[PDB]
Design a protein around this ligand. Structure first.
Ligand code: F6C
Ligand code: F6C
Ligand code: CLA
Ligand code: CLA
Ligand code: CLA
Ligand code: CLA
Ligand code: CLA
Ligand code: CLA
Ligand code: CLA
Ligand SMILES: CC1=C(/C=C/C(C)=C/C=C/C(C)=C\C=C\C=C(C)\C=C\C=C(C)\C=C\C2=C(C)CCCC2(C)C)C(C)(C)CCC1
Ligand code: SF4
Lengths: 42, 137, 29, 80, 65, 31, 46, 139, 46, 739
């Protein structure tokens, strides 16, 4: 059916979790890591 | 020899444009001139080739006519500028055109191809490299 | 100065342009 | 901070010092010109880099040169 | 018409097409420029020439800016 | 017939090797 | 009156007079000989 | 401590900010012959008092602008001084540095950042590669 | 104002017209301007 | 101060947001780092190049993996002319059902993208047939990238850090990179074509499991060692050969047929194998020219410093003083980078010009959208590389050039007549611009006034003569290869023109892009391209040659490559640095490449439509470009989504506007300048400090972007919008009307 995102390829559940992880789950922690890195006192 | 260009009077596409053109001053005589003298492409429009030993005057006349006029303007300005350098206020001679000087410069510029050749041979055409302002390298 | 080495290379290169134009004008084949 | 250098072509016209909006420049005794004075830049920490001094300098080329360097609070002209 | 029915110049497409700027790009800029883009070889050809003239001066100004 | 579940998982594990070596090179270049 | 003559020799005034005079010459060439083209100049009318 | 009466000013939005209390602040003091209206460096008008005034300003350029372009040029007041005030309370007088205005030559002032050559003789940067020396700083 | 146009472009591109800011979706009726039109029409008796 | 950036205390002490911006901008400028030595500079660069190589291999691994995982490579093999290649799957959770249905195509049951990079055609030509073969290649590239990542780390350890002398040894590097990196790699690739690709194109599977005992030719290697090389050219593929099958398939491994395979309409695989065989021999020979450790070989320093031509006293090569140059290149990394970028720029242009005219991949010439994408991709990259070549040339003048060690040589002579060079480049630009634009608008006015016959239509006779000289008999010329009786066509002494029958068949074929017929419309656009090339060169050359200084700024070299200005004094000095000239040149490079790709795309669009007459009659005036190319072909692009629904072009519609938006944003950074925004930021600083409940406070003081930073940021938005807008239009206008 064409009412939902699906995948006929192997392990189609991988995009189901990797797209949220890379794009709106991990990026804020990654920004926090970089922000701490670029603000550290000498 | 070129075969993709044919005389406009023998191009059926050109004849279609000639027949359908408005009957005004702008199309009556110019179309007749194009038919006899111009070479047309497959689209029926005149094309200007540079691969003909014949009609070489059709290339050299417009080229020579422009180069003489452009050289005439350039030599008029150059000779006028050189004549104003000796004046006390050369800048004032540029926003105020000196009529006796401009007429003299224009009169000599008629024979500019001869004058330019003489200046080049005598070394008066160009200034020396070491006497021209330049920036540090 | 006649610029010998300058004009010799210039004449050789100009000879090539004239030679190509000769083929292009059907003077030679 | 910015770096302001004064070269030996200075004629001691005091125009760069008068033009400075943060009092970086002062005129000091000298003997290399008729005016017997030369520009100095003892307070380059207060220099903002506006290059008003270079604009005022009448010599050719400039007798005073500003080289923009490390940016500080007062060199950036920040009131906050 | 005689019956009092009004057919508009663009057929009432403002309500549904102007709510996106793709609709402005397509149904206003692209669609309504047909007259000026096809005005060559007609009495409106001056507007076609000036349409390109305005585009030239705009790009020309970017050199100064 | 595209690759199977096992092949995708194997590629993920294999990609960890350049992943860790990229971190080692990046931190070494930072020195 | 000599001041008016000096004004007429100004660069913008002379540029306008020259541009107008050249424009008129070119305009009359279009009226008298419309449709002149490369490969057609100085050829008799068919 | 710096003495003087602040000019009559009803308040403004261009005054001091957190930087004044955290990093540094500037104070300009001057004496005027009469009560008159001057322009605050950051907008608005203020009334300087009859006696000696004291104005707190966020940047040193404000004092140079006020003292140089208004006090001296317009009001003929030549005794203005600019101080730098630190949050710890330390105050140093920075303008005029030695009591004489910088535009007037004064004995005892050393030459600072003077290059003993014309600017066209600075060495090329290729000669000073990896040495950390700028061409204008080269000997 | 403008970012909701970008919202409309993305919703329309997604094939989600019901999520658009439109008369047929999430409505933004200019009620105050509509009220003025009714008041000015009823003032003359129309 | 802050630890970040580690390489600059001047930035680390900056109390504003400019510190973060400039750390990213100067991170890879290793020469300006604090306490940087020449040896540490080369060692850090050497390890950085290992990282970049690993990134390339990982990128190629990702392309292979996603095709083998989510593509349709095996289905595309059976019908390359009608199956749409799949790039990868789509997982956008914000899609609606109409979008999901629209992007579910090409035989897939999930939303997918359509590959336009041509990797399906490339892998098909080189003998790949199964998704497992693609998967093994992807895994192999993961390990190869791991190898280079480890190599970069290894060559930074104290025992493996190369000395500065090792980096400066130019002659051994040239020998190994010519003979080994170029020659041996070419020989190995020809081996892959002979052993794998050619047998696979004839229906025979050759892989790691059977290539050791499956000879590529019946004559074997015995024919090579006995001098019987002609056995390899016997029995080529017949004109009725069917690709990926033995039907009509020969046994030759090294032919020189020329032209195209009749079915695939691409270069013969056996021709390409013999190409890389001959290229390998030439480059291996070239790799023995310079002396390294055995006395024999040229010394580049000696050749440049030579002053005697068989006894006669000369200034140098071509009687020109080349002395002192060896140290100039060998000590200037920017000089070397300038040549490398320029060479890659020309190579990328040649790739674009030669891949569309002589397609090397099976059926790739019939994938119209792929052809347009590949040409535009490599031309725009070439333009960027060309800008970089002159950008680092300007950097070379300031940082690495000193007049003392280059006194009187050919490099110094160029700097001494820079005014003549710049003024003459200005004249060529003015001549081309005045007459090319003037003839366009003359044709605009004539066509607008219903007088299309009054257009000036100059025939490109010089280029038509070249096409005839290459065998194109359409124009009726009877010169050189278009004349069968010409000495060029017969090759009278030897008659070894075994390439000519194939070459002439491809040249005179009307269904390919080999020497497309050109008329007056093509004449004018090449002169537009010439104008763009000369102006972009003028901006770049003027910036490079004025990098040291000018009359307005005699001491520009003391200020570096990239500085904002020198203040409002002396009339004003905006955009005076050499960096600013490169900044201005990117605008002209984008404009020139715009004209180039517009011309390529519209001409091929007319050919693919079957409406070649449209281009021939409308390209002679600018309204024809604006109406019949831009306006006409935007119709289906801008209908990717509308109030009536969405189709597969909705992405190109949204990206079309996204590019316009990025382009518009650039105008803000480019037109408005810094001092306006700094004053506005000061007002917002006041507002924040006086607002209760706003407990946040900046650790870095907010400041407006610097003057140079604004030009870079604006140029980035301008370029990104430029590429995105045209890329969306290029894909949508071709894929919407074709496969
Ligand atoms: C941090 C902290 C802080 C705070 C607190 O704390 C704040 C606050 C304020 C107040 C007061 C006001 C009001 C608000 C509003 O409405 O607006 C905004 C919005 C928002 C949304 C903002 C935001 C908020 C916060 C930030 C929150 C956060 C959270 C998140 C989620 C985090 C996340 C994390 C992750 C990792 C990513 C404002 C404002 C302004 N801002 Mg402002 N902030 C700040 C930050 C920032 C930054 C970074 C920047 C840069 C981008 C800026 C910018 C700006 C501008 C332009 C302006 C304007 O105009 C305004 C005004 O003035 O008026 C008047 N600003 N501020
Ligand atoms: C570079 C570029 C270019 C070129 C090159 O080549 C050209 C050329 C042409 C030709 C071929 C013809 C005629 C020739 C004669 O005239 O002839 C007589 C004379 C003689 C022979 C000779 C004469 C000489 C003289 C007089 C001398 C003097 C001159 C002066 C110096 C100039 C300057 C001045 C000023 C202008 C004022 C023509 C024409 C036309 N046009 Mg065309 N052009 C162009 C441009 C343009 C533009 C921009 C536009 C827009 C405005 C347009 C427009 C138009 C119209 C409407 C029309 C008409 O109608 C006509 C006809 O029909 O066609 C066919 N187009 N053109
Ligand atoms: C550089 C190569 C590359 C690129 C550009 C992509 C691109 C993509 N992958 Mg992917 N992938 C790759 C290699 C690559 N792949 C490899 C080698 C593997 C096997 C380990 C995978 C396994 C994989 C899975 C399992 C999935 C994707 C998915 C996706 C899509 C969403 C992004 C995502 O979820 O990432 C996920 C990424 C990974 C799981 C690992 C990626 C490993 C590569 C080698 C990292 C490359 C880092 C890069 C070179 C450094 C950048 C430097 C910086 C300066 C730019 C996107 C089209 C998703 C998808 O199909 O959505 C529809 C998804 O679910 N990828
Ligand atoms: C006075 C006449 C005159 C002459 C002989 C030249 C000669 C030259 N110019 Mg030049 N120029 C002139 C006026 C002139 N210029 C003016 C007025 C301008 C300002 C628009 C320029 C702007 C200019 C540029 C920007 C460039 C040249 C270049 C050149 C050189 C080659 C191209 C060329 O011929 O220019 C072609 C002509 C132009 C580009 C524009 C000039 C057209 C104006 C309208 C002519 C005005 C004539 C004058 C008003 C007549 C008054 C005479 C009267 C008082 C008697 C050549 C040395 C090029 C160069 O350095 O190449 C080496 C170059 O890049 N010129
Ligand atoms: C609210 C708007 C919105 C958002 C947030 C997303 C978000 C997403 N969409 Mg999406 N989409 C939208 C609207 C939106 N979409 C609309 C309106 C349409 C049309 C109907 C689509 C159609 C669409 C398709 C067809 C696809 C997506 C995909 C994606 C995903 C990949 C991220 C992405 O788009 O690039 C984010 C980009 C980055 C994070 C950049 C990566 C960093 C690299 C290193 C930058 C390098 C730059 C490069 C080298 C220079 C340019 C190269 C270029 C010239 C080739 C992500 C989940 C893709 C997907 O499924 O992904 C798995 C996909 O195939 N979308
Ligand atoms: C045969 C031996 C050999 C081979 C194959 C290579 C191969 C390579 N060397 Mg190399 N090198 C060698 C001997 C060799 N070297 C020797 C003897 C020295 C010492 C004198 C060096 C010193 C050296 C340095 C200092 C550097 C390299 C680098 C490189 C890489 C360049 C990037 C690349 O992939 O280019 C692309 C490869 C192609 C085949 C494409 C060519 C196609 C062109 C465009 C067509 C013409 C490449 C892998 C660079 C590096 O670090 O990379 C990691 C680098 O900076 N080399
Ligand atoms: C308009 C010019 C243009 C066009 C048509 C192409 C075409 C192509 N490029 Mg490409 N490229 C270009 C310019 C262009 N390139 C430039 C200037 C760069 C330098 C940055 C690159 C860098 C580049 C890389 C690194 C890659 C490609 C790839 C590709 C191919 C697949 C992508 C595609 O379908 O087209 C591209 C279609 C577009 C619409 C281009 C715009 C895409 C985004 C929206 C531009 C903005 C980037 C981002 C959003 C902003 C920063 C974040 C295709 C042949 C890929 C490849 O080789 O395939 C295997 C690949 O990996 N390109
Ligand atoms: C192999 C090619 C190559 C190499 C090794 C270099 C190397 C270098 N260049 Mg160079 N350059 C190149 C190609 C190359 N360039 C090309 C093709 C161009 C033309 C566009 C330029 C134009 C150029 C200029 C104008 C300048 C340099 C500078 C430099 C030096 C400092 C790098 C820097 O600023 O920090 C790293 C810089 C960045 C990371 C810039 C940020 C990214 C930019 C803004 C692109 C925007 C990103 C985009 C949206 C998405 C891209 C993909 C993403 C993953 C980044 C460094 C030696 C600078 C220099 O020497 O200063 C004196 C300098 O001013 N280069
Ligand atoms: C449509 C946009 C546009 C146009 C037409 C030009 C035109 C020009 N640019 Mg340019 N530029 C632009 C945008 C544009 N630029 C942008 C956006 C940038 C990025 C900032 C640049 C950056 C740039 C640089 C860095 C350089 C140029 C240069 C040039 C000149 C070289 C071409 C030439 O000589 O042709 C001939 C001239 C033209 C085609 C200009 C139009 C001439 C008009 C049509 C004559 C009409 C006369 C008529 C009587 C006027 C009516 C009266 C009126 C005054 C009221 C030319 C004047 C180069 C240059 O000056 O070299 C000489 C140069 O170095 N430009
Ligand atoms: C055949 C022909 C052709 C071709 C041609 C050619 C190719 C040429 C070349 C040419 C050349 C290669 C040249 C060179 C030159 C050089 C120089 C060096 C010059 C100089 C000049 C001058 C110096 C000038 C001056 C003047 C005058 C005289 C007047 C006015 C003023 C002035 C001052 C400007 C064509 C197709 C087009 C057309 C047809 C015919
Ligand atoms: S303005 Fe120039 S010349 Fe005058 S004192 Fe200052 S540095 Fe010397």
């Amino acid at each position: 059916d064409m009412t939902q995102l699906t995948g006929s390829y192997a392990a189609s559940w991988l995009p189901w979790i990797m797209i949220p992880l890379i794009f709106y789950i991990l990026p804020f922690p990654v920004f926090a890591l970089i922000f701490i890195w670029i603000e550290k006192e000498a | 020899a070129n075969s993709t260009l044919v005389p406009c009077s023998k191009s059926p596409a050109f004849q279609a444009r000639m027949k359908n053109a408005p009957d005004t001053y702008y199309f009556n005589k110019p179309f007749k001139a194009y038919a006899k003298y111009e070479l047309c492409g497959t689209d029926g429009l005149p094309h200007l080739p540079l691969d003909r030993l014949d009609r070489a005057t059709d290339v050299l006349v417009p080229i020579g006519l422009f180069l003489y006029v452009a050289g005439f303007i350039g030599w008029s300005g150059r000779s006028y500028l050189r004549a104003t350098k000796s004046a006390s206020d050369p800048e004032m001679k540029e926003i105020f055109i000196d009529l006796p000087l401009a007429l003299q410069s224009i009169s000599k510029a008629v024979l500019w191809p001869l004058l330019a050749l003489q200046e080049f041979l005598s070394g008066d055409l160009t200034a020396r490299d070491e006497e021209i302002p330049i920036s540090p390298r | 100065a006649p610029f010998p080495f300058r004009t010799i290379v210039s004449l050789i290169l100009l000879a090539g342009n004239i030679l190509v134009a000769a083929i292009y004008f059907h003077i030679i084949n | 901070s910015h770096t302001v250098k004064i070269y030996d072509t200075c004629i001691g016209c005091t125009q760069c010092v008068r033009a400075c909006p943060t009092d970086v420049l002062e005129m000091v005794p000298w003997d290399g010109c008729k005016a017997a004075q030369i520009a100095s830049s003892p307070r380059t920490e207060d220099c903002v880099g506006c290059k008003r001094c270079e604009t005022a300098c009448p010599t050719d080329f400039l007798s005073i040169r500003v080289y923009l360097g490390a940016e500080t609070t007062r060199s950036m002209g920040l009131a906050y | 018409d005689s019956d009092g029915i009004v057919t508009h110049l663009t057929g009432g497409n403002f309500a549904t097409s102007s709510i996106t700027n793709n609709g402005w790009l397509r149904d206003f800029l692209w669609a309504q420029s047909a007259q000026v883009i096809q005005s060559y070889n007609s009495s409106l050809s001056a507007y076609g020439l000036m349409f390109l003239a305005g585009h030239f001066i705009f790009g020309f100004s970017l050199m100064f800016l | 017939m595209n690759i199977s579940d096992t092949q995708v998982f194997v590629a993920l594990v294999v990609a960890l090797l350049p992943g860790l070596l990229a971190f080692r090179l990046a931190t070494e270049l930072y020195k | 009156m000599q001041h008016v003559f000096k004004y007429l020799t100004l660069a913008p005034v002379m540029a306008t007079f020259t541009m107008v005079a050249l424009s008129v010459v070119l305009i009359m060439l279009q009226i008298w000989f419309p449709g002149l083209q490369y490969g057609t100049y100085f050829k008799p009318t068919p | 401590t710096l003495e003087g009466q602040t000019p009559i000013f009803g308040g403004g939005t261009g005054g001091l900010l957190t930087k004044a209390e955290r990093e540094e602040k500037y104070v300009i003091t001057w004496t005027s012959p009469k009560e008159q209206v001057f322009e605050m460096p950051t907008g608005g008008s203020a009334i300087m008092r009859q006696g000696k005034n004291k104005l707190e300003i966020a940047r040193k350029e404000y004092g140079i602008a006020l003292g140089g372009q208004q006090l001296r040029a317009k009001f003929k007041i030549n005794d203005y001084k600019i101080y730098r005030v630190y949050p710890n309370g330390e105050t140093q007088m920075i303008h005029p540095a030695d009591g004489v205005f910088p535009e007037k030559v004064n004995q005892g002032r050393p030459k600072v950042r003077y290059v003993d050559r014309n600017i066209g003789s600075n060495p090329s940067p290729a000669k000073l590669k990896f040495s950390g020396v700028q061409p204008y700083d080269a000997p | 104002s403008f970012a909701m146009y970008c919202h409309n472009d993305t919703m329309r591109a997604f094939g989600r017209p019901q999520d658009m800011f439109s008369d047929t979706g999430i409505q933004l009726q200019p009620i105050f301007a509509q009220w003025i039109q009714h008041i000015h029409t009823a003032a003359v008796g129309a | 101060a802050t630890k970040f950036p580690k390489f600059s205390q001047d930035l680390a002490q900056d109390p504003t947001t400019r510190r973060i911006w400039y750390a990213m901008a100067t991170a890879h400028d290793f020469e300006l780092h604090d306490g940087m030595t020449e040896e540490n500079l080369y060692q850090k660069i050497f390890a950085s190049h290992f990282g970049h190589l690993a990134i390339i291999f990982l990128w190629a691994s990702g392309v292979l993996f996603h095709v083998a995982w989510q593509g349709n490579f095996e289905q595309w093999i059976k019908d390359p002319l009608n199956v749409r290649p799949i790039a990868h799957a789509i997982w956008d959770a914000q899609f609606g059902p109409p979008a999901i249905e629209a992007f579910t195509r090409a035989g897939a049951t999930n939303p997918v993208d359509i590959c336009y990079s041509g990797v399906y055609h490339w892998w098909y030509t080189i003998g790949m047939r199964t998704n497992n073969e693609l998967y093994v290649g992807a895994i192999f590239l993961l390990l190869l990238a791991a190898l280079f990542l480890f190599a970069g780390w290894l060559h930074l350890q104290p025992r493996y850090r190369p000395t500065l002398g090792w980096f400066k040894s130019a002659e051994p590097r040239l020998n190994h990179h010519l003979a080994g990196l170029f020659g041996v790699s070419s020989l190995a690739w020809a081996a892959h074509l002979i052993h794998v690709a050619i047998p696979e194109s004839r229906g025979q599977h050759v892989g790691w499991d059977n290539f050791l005992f499956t000879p590529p030719h019946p004559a074997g290697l015995g024919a090579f060692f006995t001098g019987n090389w002609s056995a390899y050219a016997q029995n080529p593929d017949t004109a009725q050969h069917v690709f990926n099958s033995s039907q009509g398939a020969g046994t030759a491994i090294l032919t020189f047929l020329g032209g195209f395979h009749p079915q695939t309409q691409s270069l013969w695989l056996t021709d390409m194998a013999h190409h890389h065989v001959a290229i390998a021999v030439l480059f291996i020979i070239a790799g023995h020219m310079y002396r390294t450790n055995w006395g024999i070989g040229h010394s580049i320093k000696e050749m440049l410093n030579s002053k005697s031509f068989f006894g006669a006293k000369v200034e140098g090569p071509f009687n020109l003083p080349h002395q002192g140059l060896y140290d100039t290149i060998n000590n200037s990394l920017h000089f070397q980078l300038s040549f490398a970028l320029a060479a890659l720029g020309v190579a990328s242009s040649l790739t674009a010009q030669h891949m569309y005219s002589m397609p090397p991949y099976a059926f790739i010439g019939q994938d119209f959208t792929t052809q347009a994408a590949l040409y535009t991709h490599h031309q725009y990259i070439a333009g960027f590389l060309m800008v970089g070549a002159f950008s680092h040339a300007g950097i070379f003048w300031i940082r690495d050039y000193d007049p003392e060690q280059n006194k009187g040589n050919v490099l110094d002579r160029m700097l001494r007549h820079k005014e003549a060079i710049i003024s003459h480049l200005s004249w060529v630009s003015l001549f081309l611009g005045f007459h090319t634009l003037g003839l366009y608008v003359h044709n605009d006015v004539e066509v607008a006034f219903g007088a299309a016959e009054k257009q000036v239509l100059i025939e490109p006779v010089f280029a038509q003569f070249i096409q005839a000289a290459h065998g194109k008999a359409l124009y009726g010329f009877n010169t050189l290869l278009s004349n069968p009786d010409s000495i060029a066509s017969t090759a009278w002494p030897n008659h070894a023109n075994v390439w000519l029958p194939g070459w002439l068949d491809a040249v005179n074929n009307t269904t390919n892009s080999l020497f497309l017929t050109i008329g007056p419309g093509d004449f004018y656009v090449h002169h537009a391209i010439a104008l763009g090339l000369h102006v972009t060169t003028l901006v770049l050359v003027k910036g490079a040659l004025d990098a040291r200084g000018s009359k307005l700024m005699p001491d520009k070299k003391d200020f570096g490559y990239a500085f904002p200005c020198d203040g409002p004094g002396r009339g004003g000095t905006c955009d005076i640095s050499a960096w600013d000239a490169s900044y201005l040149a990117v605008f002209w490079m984008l404009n020139t490449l715009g004209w180039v790709t517009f011309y390529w795309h519209w001409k091929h669009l007319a050919i693919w439509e079957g409406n070649i007459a449209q281009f021939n009659e409308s390209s002679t005036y600018l309204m024809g470009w604006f109406r019949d190319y831009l306006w006409l072909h935007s119709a289906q692009l801008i209908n990717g989504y509308n109030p009536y629904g969405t189709n597969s072009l909705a992405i190109w519609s949204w990206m079309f506007l996204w590019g316009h938006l990025a382009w518009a944003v650039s105008f803000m950074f480019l037109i408005t300048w810094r001092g306006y925004w700094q004053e506005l930021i000061e007002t917002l600083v006041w507002a924040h400090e006086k607002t209760p409940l706003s407990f946040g406070y900046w650790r870095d003081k907010p400041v407006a972007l610097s003057i140079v930073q604004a030009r870079l940021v604006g140029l980035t938005h301008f370029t990104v919008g430029y590429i995105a807008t045209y890329g969306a239009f290029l894909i949508a206008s071709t894929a919407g009307k074709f496969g």
